[PDB]
Amino acid sequence: RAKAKTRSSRAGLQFPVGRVHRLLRKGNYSERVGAGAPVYLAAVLEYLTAEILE
């Protein structure tokens, strides 16, 4: 059991896929959230952040 690594690390991301998945669930957007959606969204928020900081 375990030897757990974060969804962020699996997707090659700094931004928290897991936090993003929980905010989509609790943010009243849809009944269900596919497993790709928070990876994609976390990626987009990382890219945009990187661009503004550059």
Partner DNA sequence: CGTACGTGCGTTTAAGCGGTGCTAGAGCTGTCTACGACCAATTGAGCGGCCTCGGCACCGGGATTGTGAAAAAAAAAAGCTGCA
List the structure tokens of 21.
């998945």
Give the 3-state secondary structure of residue 31.
Answer: coil
Out of 2, 12, 31, 36, name the contact with Cl ion by CB under 5 A: 36
Alpha helices, DSSP H, located in the chain: 7-11, 17-26, 37-53
Out of 12, 27, 28, 36, name the contact with DNA by CB under 7 A: 36
Task: Tell me the closest approach of the beta carbon of residue 26 to Cl ion, in angstroms.
Answer: 18
Q: Among residues 11, 5, 1, which one has the least CA distance to residue 38?
A: 11
Q: Which residues bind Cl ion (CB under 5 A)?
A: 34, 36-37
Q: Which residues bind DNA (CB under 7 A)?
A: 1-2, 4-6, 8, 16, 19, 25, 31-36
